[model samples]
Target: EVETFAFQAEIAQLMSLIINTFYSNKEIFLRELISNSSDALDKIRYESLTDPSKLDSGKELHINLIPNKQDRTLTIVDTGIGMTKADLINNLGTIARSGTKAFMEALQAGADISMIGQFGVGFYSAYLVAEKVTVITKHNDDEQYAWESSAGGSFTVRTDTGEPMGRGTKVILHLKEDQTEYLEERRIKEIVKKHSQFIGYPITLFVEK
Candidate 1:
């Protein structure tokens, strides 16, 4: 059954650190997010080599940035490996794939807090700039789904009637009051050039006039 869950204790704690400890720079959220998109592209490309029947083979590995100034929304879309409904819950709700235990152990062992990103906490950085984040994605192995959260202790996941998404992820960030700069075309382009320039795929940007 599709389900929504309160954050596991450890997950909530880690999110707290993500929000509070990273006050030094919020702009890097784009960098980390784009980095993740690149990784997803790499995964699908690698797997497509063996199983050509999965997704449409000719689809390009590219990322698109669509900005909505009226609604104060910024969307990042990637034509890469999308997540199934379960992947949405396991990855976003709890630390199923993320190294939750490893991160907790690090804290217990006195490791540097600055190294949290290395422990699979990069996704949480979206909370740095967004009041709410929505993920619409589909994987060849499973149906498309919508997952959403307010960067607190709980997230809701449900089946989506939207288009098949063909394949890959679409992340929509409801920008927070102080984070409007991310919706600017020039600012986002600069972030892409500085942080995502080395990406293996094309990254497109859009800002409505």
Candidate 2:
């Protein structure tokens, strides 16, 4: 059985704003997801430097965009630090950055990576363009888990129970009506140069041919 939970009133209101009012916020969602991928990649890269046998050791950091016509899904895969079941509960429980900044600062004195902003819903931003979002992730410390939600302020997480991805996160965005037009390679590159200049890693847009 799949378990589900809501984000409470505090975050539900914010998520409502994003899922409902952000109709024109297409590009913004991609920007935030890319930033998230960059952050996860950074965490893995930094860890690998210390331990050569880390989960993501020797992995080339990059973001992937794969579009599906039949399923109407856009999968964004990142070879980065995946999350644990506990993290899925705590992080996805609130749209707020919620102590994330201090956690990063204490670990690494890096510059701002857009953890929050006017259009920065972070992972929740995926709901801006997708009616449903599914995340497949594997962490060095945690078993593989799959998380799913429709952005109705509730979500569920369970063990993937499939072949492991080693160490990374794959976010599949089930596109809404009208199919996807703005998720092209060139367009993603344009946005990266504009809103995600701080990602500090390569952003790849998969070609369909």
Task: Give the winner by lDDT.
Answer: 1
Candidate 1: tens digits of C-alpha lDDT, residues 53-83: 6657336889898989899888889988888
Query: What is each predicted model's overall lDDT from 0 to 1?
Result: 0.79, 0.71
* After superposition, candidate 2 runs with Cα above 4 Å error: 56-58, 93-120
Residue-by-residue lDDT tens digits, candidate 2, 57-163: 33678887776766777788898888888778776423455444343343256433233343234676676678888999888888889998886678888888876
Taking all chains together, each candidate's TM-score versus the true structure is 0.87, 0.80
- In model 1, what is the error at residue 22, expressed in angstroms? 6.3
The 10-residue segment of model 2 with minimum total lDDT is 111-120
| Index of the highest-TM-score prediction | 1
- The TM-score, computed over Cα atoms with residue i paired to residue i, of candidate 2 is 0.80
- Model 2, CA-based lDDT: 0.71
**Residue 146 Cα positional deviation in candidate 2, in Å, after optimal superposition:** 0.7
